[PDB]
Amino acid sequence: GFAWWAGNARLINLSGKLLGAHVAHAGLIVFWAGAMTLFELAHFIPEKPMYEQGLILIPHIATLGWGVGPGGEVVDTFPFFVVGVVHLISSAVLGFGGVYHAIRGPETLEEYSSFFGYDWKDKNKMTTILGFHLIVLGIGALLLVAKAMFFGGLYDTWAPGGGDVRVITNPTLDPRVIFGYLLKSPFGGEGWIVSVNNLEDVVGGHIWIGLICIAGGIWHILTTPFGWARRAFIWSGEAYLSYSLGALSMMGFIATCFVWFNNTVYPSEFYGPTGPEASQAQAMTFLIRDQKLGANVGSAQGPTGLGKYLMRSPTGEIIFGGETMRFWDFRGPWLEPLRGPNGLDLNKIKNDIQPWQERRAAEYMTHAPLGSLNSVGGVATEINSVNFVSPRSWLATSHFVLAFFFLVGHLWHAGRARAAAAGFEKGIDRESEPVLSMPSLD
Amino acid sequence: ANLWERFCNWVTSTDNRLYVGWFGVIMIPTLLAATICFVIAFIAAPPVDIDGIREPVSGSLLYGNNIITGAVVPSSNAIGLHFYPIWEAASLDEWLYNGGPYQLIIFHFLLGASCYMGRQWELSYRLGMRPWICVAYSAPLASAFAVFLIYPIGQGSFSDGMPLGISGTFNFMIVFQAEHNILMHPFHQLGVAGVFGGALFCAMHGSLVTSSLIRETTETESANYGYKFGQEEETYNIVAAHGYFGRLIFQYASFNNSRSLHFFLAAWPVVGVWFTALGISTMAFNLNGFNFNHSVIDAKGNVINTWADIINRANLGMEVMHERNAHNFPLDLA
Amino acid sequence: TTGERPFSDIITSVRYWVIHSITIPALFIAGWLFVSTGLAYDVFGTPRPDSYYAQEQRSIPLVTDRFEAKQQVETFLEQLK
Amino acid sequence: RGWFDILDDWLKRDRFVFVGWSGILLFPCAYLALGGWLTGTTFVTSWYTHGLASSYLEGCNFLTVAVSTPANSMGHSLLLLWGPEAQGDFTRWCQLGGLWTFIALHGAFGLIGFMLRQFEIARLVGVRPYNAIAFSAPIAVFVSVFLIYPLGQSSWFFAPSFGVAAIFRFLLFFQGFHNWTLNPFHMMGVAGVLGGALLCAIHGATVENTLFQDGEGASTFRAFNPTQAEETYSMVTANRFWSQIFGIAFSNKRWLHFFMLFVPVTGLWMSAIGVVGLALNLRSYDFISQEIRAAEDPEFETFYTKNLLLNEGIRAWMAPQDQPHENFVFPEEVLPRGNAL
Amino acid sequence: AELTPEVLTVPLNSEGKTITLTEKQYLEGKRLFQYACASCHVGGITKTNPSLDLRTETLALATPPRDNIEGLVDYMKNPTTYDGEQEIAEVHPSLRSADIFPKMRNLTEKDLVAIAGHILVEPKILGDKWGGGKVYY
Amino acid sequence: METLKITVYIVVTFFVLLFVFGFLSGDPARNPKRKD
Amino acid sequence: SYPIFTVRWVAVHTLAVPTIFFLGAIAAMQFIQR
Ligand code: CLA
Ligand code: CLA
Ligand code: CLA
Ligand code: CLA
Ligand code: CLA
Ligand code: HEC
Ligand SMILES: CC1=C(/C=C/C(C)=C/C=C/C(C)=C/C=C/C=C(C)/C=C/C=C(C)/C=C/C2=C(C)CCCC2(C)C)C(C)(C)CCC1
Ligand SMILES: CC1=C(/C=C/C(C)=C/C=C/C(C)=C/C=C/C=C(C)/C=C/C=C(C)/C=C/C2=C(C)CCCC2(C)C)C(C)(C)CCC1
Ligand SMILES: CC1=C(/C=C/C(C)=C/C=C/C(C)=C/C=C/C=C(C)/C=C/C=C(C)/C=C/C2=C(C)CCCC2(C)C)C(C)(C)CCC1
Ligand code: OEY
């Protein structure tokens, strides 16, 4: 009994029409991935970094090792085109199947096939569909593995020489490293899974995950829910929808922080420097300049009595001074050469900084992820001129927003599911008001 | 009658003057802990080196503060986003200098407040109610998450989360405008619309119902005694109220359905506060308000100032003065 | 219910769209011309892009007198002639 | 059957927009206050009063467009068209800020008209006039911020200019010069506005989740009837819910709805009083005990002292541009600045 | 006021020859300046070394002098320190260094004129604001 | 300090498992209309 | 049998007429160049 504004809830128990909704919507996702890439490519200019150009999809492709050389220098734009065209083309096939199943195909499936038809309350059929999709996920995760090891490798920002595409011959299988990440603290200096800083660990984790997903995929095909599971859950289409909104929301917050902190699977060559990275780069820049003028940067006492360029962290490591003392957990390929075991190494600072390192720091400092909604780069008090907002800010903010609403959607549908399963989603029975049969609190 | 089943029945009982519930099991301890730490700190904590520059800021009453100026100061910039429980300090004295109380208070409050929201779902289930009062509360809870957690994550430091005091609050919102031009951000503008709108509709609805109370009393008694708790009949005349407000404006701009009207009252401030909490959360990643500094120039290319450029002159004065000893390099990138 | 003719019926009607398919572009064109012709600048006193400042001047022509105010702005304008 | 009652009759007929005796004041003035703001934001500059561009015609957008206040030189002049300042010339009038007083005065009189309208309609329909009383809260704010506050000051120049960013500048002005956030009459305003918004959300959400099931379908809206005597949500289940979540809850529907009137109305009234103080520079700017200690004790720092540094930054950095008529010239060396920035 | 020949007239070399840009060249150079330079030089400052700016009176005192087209176009080819004593193509975008500053690649010789044109005309319109910093925003 | 840390870990874990097992004990069935 | 010219008519055209006109002027304005 649903309004026009909740009309999609009229598809709960129309399995055939609901298949088309999902496949027509799957087409929309592929369409955008296709058209967007074509759009980004149509506007690409190779002379300019990707992050001066508002690109978010091309950075994902270059990260897999297509179209880029050492440095991130774009070498061949044909793989970007091929990804766009194939995605765009595949969306008509899904579009076609979506409209057919929404409008002309059987409204319901369970009369046409006992295989494709389902009842939400069939706990066995539902876990079987879960199992199928788990294998597909496991397959896909191994695809990334397969690319890294057998079909070209991946862009490795850590490679000696500026970064380069590199085949991964020794994925990390040691479970104490792989599952160690899952128990690292999410706080500073630790970073939970966000701190992964090498492709061996990335590739290895996807071997594990693809195995696990196939493992469980088979599990759920072969099993039915145990009794303790049967009694703790609500078994209904809305209930499963809510469960999933919860997980997507959680995943979305994770991605938000991944693109904001991680400079390995979001290499800075492509995406721009991280907040912390740009902040560290400014300290590098003025250390370099002032040293050239003859300042002794180990010994220069700043206004506060803390070192003007270099101080200690609370655990003693030598770090950049100023406000960026907060960012001392930062690690990047342009900085690690300067680090010894006590932190930044004063003899390397006086002797070993390279032009390429100066250059990187000047660039990242002047490309920090600060920017206005209308794409004026810099602090909010900055004048018009530089048309720049970091891909990391566009990606970080959009996914906080989406993550946030899907948690509302989780609370929205979780609670509705609990109430409709108990029978009071529509309001309170006047003749049987629970509270009027309870004793008064006082 | 088994010992666990009987515990479960007390926890979830609809008969406790205050409902507990499974959510209440986390909430009670974490809120009692955040509360007790806060009360002690506000009164007696020594000064805290918030900005990590060995310049401690006095926040409590016994150190020369009043109700307006006192605060539990945020933890040292030197800590940034590191976890800093008591057991990581060499001593309570260290923990107090570096601002440990703030971390303890905010984490426990965020948790217990999260469980508060869920507790609202829970009791609604146990009483046969509809479930979504908690969706309404998530707008303020999301606001508290943005200024105590999200904003520090994106700026890299809890030293930049909102202080727990009245003047510290204003300090946080002054620096915020200098760094983000938040007044010129459309999500703060929707917050103002949510919040002004909410006060307007509160007064409207309150005055429309009050205007149409049905006569049940004499001049010498409160009109309030015309309603008796649990009476079945409505206590005002909704078509007389719709009759007046339709004519004050025009017919179709006025509700005659009390369900739509009350749903509207809930949706307007909730949605607007979601946005303005999203505004703080996305400005945490420095996607700032509109910047029209020097967007207007003449045929020669002189700058012709607007009100935006005046705003910016004041943002500049906030910028150059805040945390006056803490910056060694020319741009405040965080 | 007040006896006027309902809106949903006026703007599905042929007659309505027969008048207003004329009156609405006439107004849009009328106001356009108010700008494109320059009259809006003149009616209102608003400086054109070339006449905020005198050529080598970087002074706002700020009104500083109450009862000589009219003549003040007039003098600034002749400083642009 | 005299003419006066013939007109009474026609004014008070039931029509799509009711007119009334109050219409006579209300409608001309409301249309003119609004015609002037749209007229001025689309076409008119602030070059000669403020040194600012301020219309779409000049290049501004909807955020930066404003009808700006007259020059400080104008003082509190009514700035009538036919008056000694504009001397009948429409063009000069606009360039002097004439439309600011135009909007503000027709605005004031229109608000009167509106409130008299609420009195007029309520008398005819036979309801109590509490909507009209609530409307005093907006009226007090308007008269205190737009009329009383500059009348206390040197001139109209220092009132709010009618525009989005211009009003944003006014909010920052009051922080740097008046330290308005520290004023307890503003704090009572904040607790009333936010309290209102709280009350608004929480009462709408309670009703929506204590509804009776009076229809069969999942859209609960259909199941209300405007004429039903029966209440549509359970005050009993609402009261028990909040007593157990929050400890206290409403039990009296009349007190509840009267409290929704009381809370936001009163907060606006308290802030009106505060701004009246500020007309006169009677600020709650400082705490004397704090200043004596900090003067004598350079290790003594609070958020109270930090915020005044910021206020000091705002005053010196915005004043020359914001008050052009003062010819403030602040060479760089005198500007307050922290390290590096 | 408007963009007239006088303001569009700038020195070509130190001898004191002059050249008069077209409006078109002025907008061309402003554009190229935002594309290749403003990330460090917005408003005529230098964000990564604020001691050195693009005020004409600073350029005049550079070694070699740089308050003219020839000097500016040379600098975009082979930049030096302010005293002239070391070439710095390695850390400053230049044609001599366009391998490592990829934006400087598609700049033609006339492109360099327009860029140098802008730098010299802008101080004449904005005055103190050009290279002044936030104090003059 | 090390003693406090253990204490807190213990106290927390306790309430957490109270929570996980509280909801694993037939929570859908704790409602006033329909129980399973 | 309705009227064409009412109070309502006037109110409507009192706002609408100058709206469209104003939209015309603001449209033209996007093409103004310095
Ligand atoms: C996988 C995601 C997902 C899915 C499948 C559903 C599915 C459903 N939802 Mg849930 N929902 C979700 C996420 C999801 N939701 C999220 C994230 C939220 C939080 C906001 C909600 C909140 C929500 C509420 C409050 C309600 C539902 C309802 C419903 C049902 C009917 C919906 C309908 O017909 O809407 C039809 C769609 C519309 C009416 C259009 C809405 C358009 C949005 C608000 C505007 C977005 C504009 C965009 C951001 C920018 C525009 C750009 C411009 C150019 C246009 C259906 C089962 C209803 C329900 O309970 O039924 C059982 C209901 O009342 N949903
Ligand atoms: C992702 C978006 C999405 C999707 C996929 C669907 C899908 C669906 N909706 Mg929902 N809906 C949506 C958004 C969506 N809706 C929104 C945003 C609203 C709020 C306005 C609603 C409100 C709504 C209501 C109120 C109802 C539905 C219903 C339905 C189903 C039956 C439709 C039908 O027979 O129409 C027939 C429609 C037509 C004959 C018109 C043409 C439609 C086609 C698909 C246009 C496609 C154009 C495209 C470019 C062609 C590509 C072709 C190429 C691939 C070969 C269908 C599965 C109905 C339902 O459940 O039925 C029982 C129903 O009652 N929808
Ligand atoms: C998850 C998506 C999905 C699901 C569950 C279904 C399910 C169904 N479809 Mg639909 N359909 C889909 C997608 C889907 N289809 C798409 C994408 C299209 C357009 C290409 C269609 C077009 C379509 C038509 C035209 C018809 C159906 C029909 C049917 C029913 C019978 C199918 C049958 O016997 O095939 C049995 C199995 C096969 C024929 C094997 C196909 C082999 C596939 C192509 C290889 C799979 C590879 C991999 C998984 C795909 C990903 C590749 C990509 C990543 C590059 C069944 C309920 C029929 C029906 O109900 O008629 C009344 C019918 O006539 N479908
Ligand atoms: C899409 C993924 C997915 C989904 C939706 C399900 C869904 C389900 N699984 Mg399957 N499963 C999956 C993947 C999935 N599974 C995979 C890949 C595997 C292989 C390992 C399994 C293996 C598996 C087994 C062996 C069993 C299930 C069971 C179940 C059911 C009980 C769920 C339950 O109580 O969990 C809720 C979770 C708990 C009660 C305890 C979790 C405690 C952890 C520590 C919470 C951590 C959250 C934390 C905040 C985030 C940080 C993570 C931390 C590790 C750092 C349910 C139908 C059970 C069942 O009935 O099977 C028939 C069962 O016994 N699953
Ligand atoms: C009807 C409501 C109304 C109200 C209350 C106002 C109020 C105002 N208008 Mg607005 N105005 C209105 C309608 C209204 N206007 C209309 C319809 C128009 C368009 C024509 C305007 C156009 C307009 C402009 C253009 C301006 C104003 C201005 C003003 C202000 C100055 C008024 C003044 O000095 O009057 C003084 C005069 C009276 C109050 C008249 C009193 C009538 C006496 C008692 C009768 C005398 C009879 C006679 C002597 C006897 C016979 C003599 C014999 C020769 C026959 C004031 C706030 C000015 C303003 O805003 O400046 C900032 C201004 O410049 N008004
Ligand atoms: C940051 C990455 C920069 C970019 C991009 C551009 N310039 Fe620059 N410039 C930069 C620095 C650090 C310096 C100082 C060099 C030193 O002496 O140590 C400079 C210097 C100049 C100068 C000299 C100004 C002077 O006062 O003598 C000029 C004229 C100049 N740079 C011009 C210029 C142009 C035209 C650019 C775009 C094409 C450009 N620079 C880019 C930093 C950076
Ligand atoms: C059901 C429904 C719905 C939905 C629907 C959908 C959403 C659909 C989809 C659709 C889709 C999903 C579609 C797509 C398709 C695609 C296509 C059709 C494509 C095309 C292609 C082409 C043709 C290509 C070409 C090219 C190439 C090849 C190369 C380059 C160039 C170019 C690009 C040109 C709605 C909501 C409406 C409503 C209700 C109902
Ligand atoms: C790939 C990769 C990797 C890996 C990773 C992994 C391996 C992961 C895992 C993960 C996982 C393994 C996860 C887990 C999850 C879980 C969860 C998330 C859960 C949840 C739960 C819940 C939700 C609950 C609920 C409940 C309760 C509590 C009570 C009763 C009732 C219920 C049931 C409702 C790495 C890092 C190396 C690197 C990179 C890549
Ligand atoms: C002043 C004056 C006067 C008067 C005047 C007037 C009265 C005016 C009017 C005017 C007006 C009356 C105008 C109007 C206009 C307006 C406009 C300008 C509009 C626009 C709008 C828009 C643009 C919108 C849109 C939209 C959006 C944006 C979003 C949402 C949706 C929509 C679609 C709505 C006189 C003569 C007495 C004389 C004296 C002076
Ligand atoms: O805004 Mn200005 O930016 Ca965020 O950090 Mn850099 O300075 Mn300091 O610590 Mn608190 O405050």
Ligand SMILES: [Cl-]
């Ligand atoms: Cl500060």
Ligand SMILES: [Cl-]
């Ligand atoms: Cl610093």
Ligand SMILES: [Fe+2]
């Ligand atoms: Fe109510």
